[PDB]
Structure formats: C-alpha cells, structure tokens
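Limitations

Structures in this collection are predictions, not experimental determinations, and the ligand pose is part of the prediction. Treat each record accordingly. The example that follows, with chloride ion as the small molecule, is included so readers can see exactly what is and is not provided: the inputs are given verbatim, and the output is the predicted complex.
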Amino acid sequence: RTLIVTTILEEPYVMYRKSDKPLYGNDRFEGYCLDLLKELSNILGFLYDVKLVPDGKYGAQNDKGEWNGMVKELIDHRADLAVAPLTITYVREKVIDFSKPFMTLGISILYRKGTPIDSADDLAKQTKIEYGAVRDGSTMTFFKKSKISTYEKMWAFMSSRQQSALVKNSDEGIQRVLTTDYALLMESTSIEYVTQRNCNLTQIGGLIDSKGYGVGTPIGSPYRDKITIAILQLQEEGKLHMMKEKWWRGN
Amino acid sequence: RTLIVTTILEEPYVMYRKSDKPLYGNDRFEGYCLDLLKELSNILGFLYDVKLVPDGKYGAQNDKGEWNGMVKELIDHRADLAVAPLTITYVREKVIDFSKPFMTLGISILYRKGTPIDSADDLAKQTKIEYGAVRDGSTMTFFKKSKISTYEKMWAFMSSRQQSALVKNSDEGIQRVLTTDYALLMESTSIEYVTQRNCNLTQIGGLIDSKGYGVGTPIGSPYRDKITIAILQLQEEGKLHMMKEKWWRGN
Ligand SMILES: N[C@@H](Cn1cc(Br)c(=O)n(Cc2ccsc2C(=O)O)c1=O)C(=O)O
Ligand SMILES: N[C@@H](Cn1cc(Br)c(=O)n(Cc2ccsc2C(=O)O)c1=O)C(=O)O
Ligand SMILES: [Cl-]
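Predicted complex:
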C-alpha cells in the first residue's frame, strides 16, 4: 500500500523546488515536511505519494458538520496521512487521529531590537507602541476568546483600534513592524523564521499559548502510533533539531 | 472501576498538604498533577485512588528488560494511570502508552541578571564563566549523547571539569549559581519555578531540546485517547495555563 499523503504549500514546510530539472512526483517538492516524511518513510518502511490538498485549506468545519481541507481528505479516506504544519486540536480529534507532535509552538511577540520591552505585560499597559495580529487568524482568535485579564486588555486595544492594529496577513504585519512603531503577535515558529532573516527584528518574551503540529490520520489508522514512535526517535536522536536548523537558519 | 493512579512526590507537581486536618486518601495531596487529575476526573467521569509509587522511581530499564518505578506499575497492571512529570520517550512507548503532552519543556540555562550572556553559544566559546549540569541526570546525558558541535564542545568542558562543573543535585546547582560565577543547565520548567522565587536569577536563551510530559497508561488502555482529548480541552480553554500559574508564580 503506497500511502497518499495530503499536504499544503507553506514556507518552509512544503514548497516547489526551484528547478526546471525533470522532477516528478514527490521530487517536485522540498521543505521541512518533505524531509520529515522521508525520515518517517525510512523508519516505518512505506512508499508514499504526496498530493497537495485540492482546496488549499488546512481543515475547518461548517454548521452542518461538513469539513474541508486536509482534514476532509482524511475523513473521506482520500489520504492516509496529513503531513503539514497542522495543529492538533480538540475539534479535529473528534474526526481524525494525530501522532504526538513533531513541533511545539506558541503565540509570541515580534518587535525591534534595543527597546526596554520584554513581555506582553509591557505592551498591555501602554498605548504609544501599537500592537496587533493578523485579522481572523488563530492568534487574533486566541485573544478574542481569552479570559486572562492581561490578554483581555490586549484584545480590547486590538479590537478598538481594529482598522490599524489588525493586519491583513503576516507579510503586511512584518512590514508594519519594520516601518512603524508596531509589535506583531504571531506564532513562535514564524518569529524564529523571520528573525533569522531580519537582523533588526527580535522575539519579545516567551510563549503566550501552546500547541503542537502532528501527523493527521483517519480515526483508527494503524500508522498513527508508529509515526509517534518515529517522531520520538527523531526527536531524541537530534534529527528534528537538524531538520528545523536546515530550513530555519538565515544568512 | 475506581482507577489507581501512580504518581511520585515532586514539587510543585505532587506534595503532601501542609495540614494536620483529617485528610484522607486523595485529599492528603496537592500540586499541579493533583489539580490536573481532578480536571481529568471531571471531564472523563472517573473515580480514582492516588498511590505513591512504592520504590519512588520514575521508571527505567535494566539489562534483563526489567522495569521499575511508575512504568513498572503500569506494566504490571497495578496502576491504571501515571500522572506525574513523566517524560514521553521512545523506550517507554515500547512498553506503555502515553496521552499527548500536558506540558512541553526543554533544557535551558539558569544564570544571573545583567550580563551580556544571551545563549549557549555565548557560554561554549569561553571558560571564565563555568557551566554544567546535575551529575547523571537527563540534562547531562543529553550533552553526553549530542552530536551537535556546540553541545559537544559544551560537554567537553563539563566532562574535563568533572569535579566542579557537574553538581550533585538541582538544589546544589542553584546555590552554585547564587554564590559562584556559574550557569546551570536545567529543564525550562525548573528554571521558571526558580526564577519566580529568585529575583536575582534569570533564564538565558531558549530551549536546547524538547520533550513532553504525558499521562502514562498500560498498552491498549481505553483511557489514553480520552485523556488526550481532555488535555486538549484544558489547553485550549486556558486551564493548563491557569494551573501552571497557580503553582509556578512566586511572591
Ligand atoms: N496550523 C494551522 C494553520 N497555520 C499554519 C501556519 Br505555518 C501558521 O503560521 N498559522 C498561523 C497563522 C496563519 C495566518 S494568521 C496566523 C496567526 O498565527 O495569527 C496557521 O494558522 C492549522 O492547523 O489550521
Ligand atoms: N521527567 C523525568 C524525571 N524528571 C522529573 C523532573 Br520534575 C525533573 O525536573 N527532571 C530533571 C532532572 C532531575 C534530576 S537532574 C535533572 C536534569 O534536568 O538534569 C527529571 O528528570 C522522567 O520522566 O524520568
Ligand atoms: Cl497519541
């Protein structure tokens, strides 16, 4: 059984290779998740076929309980695995299984170097330095749902300054950080990737929340626990570190 | 079925309550893991009986493949769950199952405030500031097994300065940090706990490795995936944050 692996284009996890050489099938792609998948294939001993999710979505539910994206591909048995920056969440575990996480990440702060600002508390208690998140993303939604007082005050500031404080996308937010007195709230993984590529930029404070990326499978898949085992081996033998360093480290 | 829960005394996860009031059974204990267990019990709907692991060990293997500690209790079906600061590891997954992690942690650096030192690379390339780990602990073993060049150089320094660089326990290491020009390599969780209680002390840099604490069960336990689900709900609804803050925050 050649496993069908659903995935999604997302730098640096999954990209098309910058080549016009005759590359076919899996060889068309590169990235952290391609390297991970290769390692998993060699530990477990499976053949695989990478297929980009047709609708280009991660996977969310509508009011009728209908799913889309990579999650739908798993539910429909049109993919055996989902290998992507795919968050292990309560709602998704209702409908698919996940390996244990190959990466753990949390919301943090992207800001300039050389300022007395050291935490989210430092931003919360002032208004001179503006801060926000990508509109309608996971990070904005976190602040919107939070009952923690300091993040409620932070959401109050973001929501009241809606037009300016919230950006269209991560690229816009980084530009806002680079050009204006602005701090962007974004996933730690993304901050690490950006700060490696922008020496004027830095992470501020630690993680504001916590979640993991895991390999998705249909409910009951006999590959799930095997993939957990392989992930633990890669973790312990320093290979996940090596793969992260390969893709994250800047000039 | 009242579940037997194996655990281990370890501040602030599991402690005896500072009380001479008539407290029996589970009520004798307090701590992060007791709070977690209470939440799990209320989500899943189980009764439970907390029993300290008789040998006071986490769980390791001998040459005959014989286990001890909480892992042995699970293998022997003398406990249904292990709820403790118990690391999810490749070797343990061979013999027990684990929920997804309720806490994610990594080796980091404990040092004084106000120095130009900002990372492990800063320590590695000098000898004036001495650094090390607890002798024969997980953190020392990491550096001993690492193939990463900067941690090989760090291990070289720790091993050559064996007598002084390596400490007997965490308490000794903290005292060495407080009294000498010394940086201690220790788990991020422990650093957070200590820095909340010592205003002169701080964390240096980020995580050097990554691992998770999970709830242990016997292989095939029908509680494992339910506990994962409960953990995800607690994570997403900010309750794990609240429980960590309850036990970690200092004066
Ligand atoms: N992990 C998410 C999708 N995903 C993937 C990546 Br990579 C990522 O950086 N993010 C974060 C993100 C994307 C758009 S806004 C935003 C945010 O953190 O605010 C994400 O939500 C999921 O599983 O749905
Ligand atoms: N998690 C470990 C046991 N354990 C528990 C806690 Br709390 C802890 O801080 N550590 C770290 C530790 C303990 C003695 S030395 C050391 C270290 O990090 O070097 C640990 O190994 C296991 O599961 O065996
Ligand atoms: Cl699992």
